[PDB]
Write a protein that holds these residues in place. Structure first.
Motif, mmCIF file in Angstrom:
data_model
loop_
_atom_site.group_PDB
_atom_site.id
_atom_site.type_symbol
_atom_site.label_atom_id
_atom_site.label_comp_id
_atom_site.label_asym_id
_atom_site.label_seq_id
_atom_site.Cartn_x
_atom_site.Cartn_y
_atom_site.Cartn_z
ATOM 1 N N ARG A 160 -9.043 -0.299 -0.535
ATOM 2 C CA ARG A 160 -7.762 0.045 -1.144
ATOM 3 C C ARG A 160 -7.768 -0.174 -2.652
ATOM 4 N NH1 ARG A 160 -2.985 -1.869 3.147
ATOM 5 N NH2 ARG A 160 -3.413 -0.187 4.640
ATOM 6 N N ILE A 161 -8.568 -1.121 -3.144
ATOM 7 C CA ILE A 161 -8.735 -1.274 -4.588
ATOM 8 C C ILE A 161 -9.358 -0.016 -5.182
ATOM 9 C CG2 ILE A 161 -9.953 -2.551 -6.378
ATOM 10 C CD1 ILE A 161 -9.609 -5.059 -4.663
ATOM 11 N N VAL A 162 -10.408 0.502 -4.538
ATOM 12 C CA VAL A 162 -11.049 1.729 -5.006
ATOM 13 C C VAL A 162 -10.048 2.876 -5.028
ATOM 14 C CG1 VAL A 162 -12.777 3.465 -4.445
ATOM 15 C CG2 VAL A 162 -13.370 1.045 -4.331
ATOM 16 N N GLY A 163 -9.282 3.027 -3.947
ATOM 17 C CA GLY A 163 -8.280 4.079 -3.904
ATOM 18 C C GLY A 163 -7.238 3.945 -4.998
ATOM 19 N N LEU B 113 -13.633 -0.734 -9.721
ATOM 20 C CA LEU B 113 -14.792 -0.568 -8.848
ATOM 21 C C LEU B 113 -15.614 -1.847 -8.774
ATOM 22 C CD1 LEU B 113 -16.093 3.042 -9.627
ATOM 23 C CD2 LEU B 113 -14.421 2.271 -7.936
ATOM 24 N N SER C 240 -10.848 -4.214 -0.243
ATOM 25 C CA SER C 240 -11.833 -3.656 -1.166
ATOM 26 C C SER C 240 -11.697 -2.141 -1.264
ATOM 27 C CB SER C 240 -13.243 -4.050 -0.728
ATOM 28 O OG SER C 240 -13.570 -3.469 0.520
ATOM 29 N N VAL D 117 -19.317 6.735 -4.143
ATOM 30 C CA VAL D 117 -20.390 5.844 -3.709
ATOM 31 C C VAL D 117 -19.852 4.438 -3.468
ATOM 32 C CG1 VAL D 117 -22.559 4.779 -4.391
ATOM 33 C CG2 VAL D 117 -22.195 7.217 -4.782
ATOM 34 N N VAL D 118 -19.035 3.933 -4.396
ATOM 35 C CA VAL D 118 -18.473 2.592 -4.244
ATOM 36 C C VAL D 118 -17.579 2.523 -3.013
ATOM 37 C CG1 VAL D 118 -16.945 0.890 -5.285
ATOM 38 C CG2 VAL D 118 -18.686 2.006 -6.677
ATOM 39 N N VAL E 261 -14.938 -8.217 -4.337
ATOM 40 C CA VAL E 261 -14.102 -8.616 -3.207
ATOM 41 C C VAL E 261 -14.859 -8.448 -1.894
ATOM 42 C CG1 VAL E 261 -12.122 -7.870 -1.845
ATOM 43 C CG2 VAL E 261 -11.850 -8.340 -4.284
ATOM 44 N N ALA E 262 -15.500 -7.290 -1.708
ATOM 45 C CA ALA E 262 -16.181 -7.008 -0.448
ATOM 46 C C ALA E 262 -17.343 -7.965 -0.201
ATOM 47 C CB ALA E 262 -16.669 -5.559 -0.434
ATOM 48 N N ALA F 15 -13.617 -4.385 -6.724
ATOM 49 C CA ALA F 15 -13.692 -4.075 -5.300
ATOM 50 C C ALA F 15 -15.031 -4.496 -4.713
ATOM 51 C CB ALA F 15 -13.450 -2.585 -5.075
ATOM 52 N N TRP G 120 0.821 -1.207 0.000
ATOM 53 C CA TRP G 120 0.000 0.000 0.000
ATOM 54 C C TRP G 120 0.857 1.261 0.000
ATOM 55 C CZ3 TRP G 120 -4.185 1.313 -1.884
ATOM 56 C CH2 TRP G 120 -4.938 2.406 -1.439
ATOM 57 N N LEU H 264 -19.724 2.339 -0.029
ATOM 58 C CA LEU H 264 -20.370 1.035 0.077
ATOM 59 C C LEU H 264 -19.417 -0.008 0.649
ATOM 60 C CD1 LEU H 264 -22.719 -0.569 -2.534
ATOM 61 C CD2 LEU H 264 -20.799 -1.895 -1.682
ATOM 62 N N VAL H 265 -18.258 -0.187 0.009
ATOM 63 C CA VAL H 265 -17.330 -1.242 0.405
ATOM 64 C C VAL H 265 -16.785 -1.038 1.812
ATOM 65 C CG1 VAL H 265 -16.715 -1.606 -2.007
ATOM 66 C CG2 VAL H 265 -15.329 -0.083 -0.586
ATOM 67 N N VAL I 20 -25.965 0.648 -7.373
ATOM 68 C CA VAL I 20 -24.582 1.054 -7.606
ATOM 69 C C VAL I 20 -24.048 0.412 -8.881
ATOM 70 C CG1 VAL I 20 -22.249 0.993 -6.675
ATOM 71 C CG2 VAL I 20 -24.179 1.493 -5.169
ATOM 72 N N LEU J 250 -10.855 1.949 -14.286
ATOM 73 C CA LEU J 250 -11.475 2.480 -13.076
ATOM 74 C C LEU J 250 -12.775 1.753 -12.751
ATOM 75 C CD1 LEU J 250 -11.375 4.827 -10.902
ATOM 76 C CD2 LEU J 250 -12.949 6.005 -12.432
ATOM 77 N N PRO K 91 -8.229 4.322 3.038
ATOM 78 C CA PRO K 91 -8.858 3.013 3.247
ATOM 79 C C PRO K 91 -7.848 1.968 3.697
ATOM 80 C CG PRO K 91 -8.564 3.426 0.920
ATOM 81 C CD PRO K 91 -8.262 4.721 1.620
ATOM 82 N N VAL L 104 -7.260 2.410 -8.067
ATOM 83 C CA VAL L 104 -7.724 2.742 -9.413
ATOM 84 C C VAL L 104 -8.004 4.236 -9.531
ATOM 85 C CG1 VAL L 104 -8.548 0.437 -9.987
ATOM 86 C CG2 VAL L 104 -10.056 2.014 -8.764
ATOM 87 N N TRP L 105 -8.612 4.830 -8.501
ATOM 88 C CA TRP L 105 -8.862 6.268 -8.522
ATOM 89 C C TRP L 105 -7.556 7.053 -8.557
ATOM 90 C CZ3 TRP L 105 -12.131 9.281 -10.330
ATOM 91 C CH2 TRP L 105 -12.306 10.597 -9.888
ATOM 92 N N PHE M 298 -20.757 -1.110 4.529
ATOM 93 C CA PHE M 298 -21.930 -1.962 4.362
ATOM 94 C C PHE M 298 -21.895 -3.161 5.303
ATOM 95 C CE2 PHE M 298 -21.197 -6.034 2.203
ATOM 96 C CZ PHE M 298 -19.842 -5.958 1.968
#
Ligand SMILES: CCCCCCCC/C=C/CCCCCCCC(=O)OC[C@H](O)CO
Ligand SMILES: CCCCCCCC/C=C\CCCCCCCC(=O)OC[C@H](O)CO
Ligand SMILES: NS(=O)(=O)c1cccc2c1c([N+](=O)[O-])cc1[nH]c(=O)c(=O)[nH]c12
Ligand SMILES: CCCCCCCCCCCCCCCC(=O)O
Ligand SMILES: CCCCCCCCCCCCCCCC(=O)O
Ligand SMILES: *C(=O)CCCCCCCCCCCCCCC
Lengths: 401, 149, 84, 90, 49
Positions: free
Chosen positions: C48-51, A383, C46, C1-2, A389-390, A386, A168, C5-6, B130, A379, C42, C53-54, C9
């Protein structure tokens, strides 16, 4: 009416085998003959010239051969054909006013719109660099984990730099984002420092090489003159052997044109082709590396025919014209000459030019979203991944209970 | 009781807007053709009169002209990466997948009241919504990335 | 939003496991895009995946803007409103 | 008048296009202030020519003099001399 | 010389009495003929003394 079989001027009908008389043929000059005849109240009979040549002087037996010979020797009374007006022919026949002004133009292979690829944001760097960055990323993360958590004289963990956290930190360092923990130890700060320096060069290089790409693609100038071709040595301009387009450069006294003639005379392999069909093919079968020098009328036809890989560029290098011809001492000279000036004012010569060279044709600054489409797919893909995964984790834990 | 009303109203609004977008033909205002080739008719020999048009996802139409209201069916495949993009823009799977996911979303909200103890139905609704938005994103990019060729 | 959510939730993490609510998620995405900072990051796979790619998407876009702006300022091409 | 139309084109700052003959449009494009140019192609085909009285004996000799100068290249050199060499734009 | 002929910002100039003016007047080279044309009618007179 002597005539020559050349497209689009004269062309056999789709099913000319089930046709007799003047209806067997069609084209610009066939329609022109109908227009001229009705305006002067004459009846004609189209007859193709048997030899197929336009009109040249043997220069030995001094016997005119072709359409010109078919007029001086009284074999026909009107030559409705794309017969160029020249001094040598003017001394044996009397042309009418030009019904189509033309000249020598430049034909090149029509380029492509070069639709950007989906993953073209990677273009500033080579595939090897991108692959090596991933390897470097993995190595740095592993070494960051090795130097931070191996010593049993510091362990409760001595810090928060586990393998998952080392990855990370390295990921956020490359992107110049991220917060959280930074290495507090000497060895760990050495890993951070070189990785930060590596990131700084790579990210600057990507931005600097993308700017270079966008700027040089913005400086490109399409060739729109003969002079541009003369200066350039990559593309090879070429004319024909037998005809005006070769005499024009040979006798040209213009410096912009004299240099081109010199080159073509001694250049190898011989750019001088033989048949117009061969020439027009070379340009297409060379991926935009040949330039053909032909008439502006023929060029504007080819361009409007499939596979639509040719186009007209620049402007005419000279000014010639096609004029209806008649024998000497005839009586049609004046009615025909006026007939060609009536069909022009009324716009009937431009209607026929659009009719055959277009109407009956076959070929018809900012960054766009296509240039960054791929990073948008990654991207959204990330999403979705992710989310996948969750949920899997949620499902696994839920089942256990 | 009051936070579910916004969810129900929003889900209907989103499904309605995405069904009218997919169904109507006001996605783009281009200047093309809306009639087939008039071979014999020779109205314009081959290239007809290019006029202002309103395109959508399946049919192209004409605002002005003598053919005002005639609507041709957009032909995507003309004459790898390019072919795959043309197969996704022609089928409009992503603009239609969003509709199916928006519809499934609302179904979960409907089921969220006949079974008031299964809390995993409300989570499914949220995931469908979503995900539906994600499909919309892809559809928008695919549509825009196709009209540029 | 994603990202929201991750992160919030799952009930098997809650008091809240992190600070990535909807309001904070919007702040995180904005700060990430603007090349500024990171008030919160994050900590889950999950998230960290969003972070990631963003962060990659942002990088390309910001570089593209700067690169294409430099091209504009370097070469000044004039547009002819009429060509036919 | 032609001078009026040219003037209406600079005054309008670019909200007026004058439709005139190509030869004159390529003369004002090479004269200061150098703010007017030509766009597109010719919408028509018309030709300047040399006229003689009907029945005159100088008709044919003039016809061959004009034609010879075109093949030689004088008529093209003359145009470039009085349109671009004597220009003021560059 | 060709670069100066293409450019219109800087104003090349010769003299009046001597060879350097005859050379351009009698020059048959296109790169030089254009410069002679310009200097003959350009104002103010580039021809110094
Ligand atoms: C534990 C911390 C890590 C968490 C994980 C976060 C993920 C971050 C990744 C972003 C970059 C991914 C971009 C992938 C680009 C693929 C390009 C591709 O498909 O290649 C082009 C193709 O070969 C054409 O020829
Ligand atoms: C407090 C602890 C801080 C962390 C400690 C480590 C940080 C390392 C940072 C950057 C190293 C960059 C080194 C760059 C060296 C360039 C090589 C060089 O000098 O090349 C000369 C050249 O070859 C002549 O022709
Ligand atoms: N089609 S072509 O391949 O470009 C072509 C090539 C070579 C000579 C041509 C010629 C055409 N032409 O354009 O129809 C007309 C024409 N007319 C004359 O009077 C003459 O002497 N030679 C020609
Ligand atoms: C943190 C280090 C890695 C950062 C992410 C970089 C993403 C690029 C890696 C994939 C690209 C591989 C190159 C193959 C495609 C090509 O350019 O031909
Ligand atoms: C084929 C469509 C793909 C894109 C949309 C996929 C959405 C899948 C949602 C499934 C339900 C997720 C929650 C289930 C909860 C559970 O039962 O544990
Ligand atoms: C436990 O395993 C529950 C089911 C898991 C479902 C995983 C998929 C969820 C949606 C992720 C992909 C969304 C894509 C949106 C655009 C099509």
């Amino acid at each position: 009416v002597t005539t020559i079989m050349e497209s689009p001027y004269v062309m056999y009908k789709k099913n000319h085998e089930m046709f007799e008389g003047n209806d067997k043929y069609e084209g610009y000059c066939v329609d022109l003959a109908s227009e001229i005849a009705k305006h002067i109240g004459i009846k004609y009979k189209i007859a193709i010239v048997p030899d197929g040549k336009y009109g040249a002087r043997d220069a030995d037996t001094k016997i005119w051969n072709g359409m010109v010979g078919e007029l001086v020797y009284g074999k026909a009374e009107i030559a409705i054909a794309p017969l160029t007006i020249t001094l040598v022919r003017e001394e044996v026949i009397d042309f009418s006013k030009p019904f189509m002004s033309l000249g020598i133009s430049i034909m090149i292979k029509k380029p492509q719109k070069s639709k950007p690829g989906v993953f073209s944001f990677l273009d500033p760097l080579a595939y090897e660099i991108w692959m090596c960055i991933v390897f470097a990323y993995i190595g740095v993360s592993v070494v960051l984990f090795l130097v931070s958590r191996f010593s049993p004289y510091e362990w409760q963990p001595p810090n928060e730099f586990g393998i998952f956290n080392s990855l990370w930190f390295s990921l956020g360092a490359f992107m110049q984002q991220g917060c959280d923990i930074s290495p507090r130890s000497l060895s760990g700060r050495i890993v951070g420092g070189v990785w930060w320096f590596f990131t700084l060069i790579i990210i600057s290089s990507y931005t600097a090489n993308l700017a270079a790409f966008l700027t040089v693609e913005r400086m490109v100038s399409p060739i729109e003159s003969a002079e541009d071709l003369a200066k350039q040595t990559e593309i090879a301009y070429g004319t024909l052997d037998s005809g005006s387009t070769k005499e024009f450069f040979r006798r040209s006294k213009i410096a912009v044109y004299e240099k081109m003639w010199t080159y073509m005379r001694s250049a190898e392999p011989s750019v001088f082709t033989r048949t117009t069909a061969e020439g027009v093919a070379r340009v297409r079968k060379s991926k935009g590396k040949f330039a053909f020098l032909l008439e502006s009328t023929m060029n504007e036809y080819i361009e409007q025919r499939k596979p639509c890989d040719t186009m007209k560029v620049g402007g005419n290098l000279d000014s010639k014209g096609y004029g209806v011809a008649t024998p000497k001492g005839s009586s049609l000279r004046t009615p025909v000459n006026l007939a060609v000036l009536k069909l022009s004012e009324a716009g009937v010569l431009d209607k026929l030019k659009n009719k055959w060279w277009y109407d009956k044709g076959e070929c018809g600054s900012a960054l766009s979203l296509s240039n960054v489409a791929g990073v948008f797919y990654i991207l959204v893909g990330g999403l979705g991944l992710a989310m996948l995964v969750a949920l899997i984790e949620f499902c696994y834990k839920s089942r256990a209970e | 009781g009051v936070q579910m009303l916004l969810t129900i109203v929003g889900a209907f609004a989103a499904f309605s807007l995405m069904t009218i977008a997919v169904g109507t033909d006001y996605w783009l205002y281009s200047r093309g053709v809306c009639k087939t080739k008039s071979v014999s008719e020779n109205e314009t020999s081959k290239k007809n009169e290019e006029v202002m048009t309103h395109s959508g996802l399946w049919r192209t139409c004409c605002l002005e002209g003598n053919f005002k209201g005639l609507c041709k069916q957009i032909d995507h495949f003309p004459e790898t990466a390019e072919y795959f993009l043309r197969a996704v823009r022609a089928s409009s799977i992503f603009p239609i997948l969003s509709v199916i996911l928006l519809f499934m979303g609302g179904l979960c909200i409907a089921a969220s009241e006949f079974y008031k103890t299964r809390h995993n139905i409300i989570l499914s609704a949220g995931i469908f919504f979503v995900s539906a938005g994600l499909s919309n994103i892809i559809g928008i990019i695919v549509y825009i990335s196709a009209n540029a060729g």
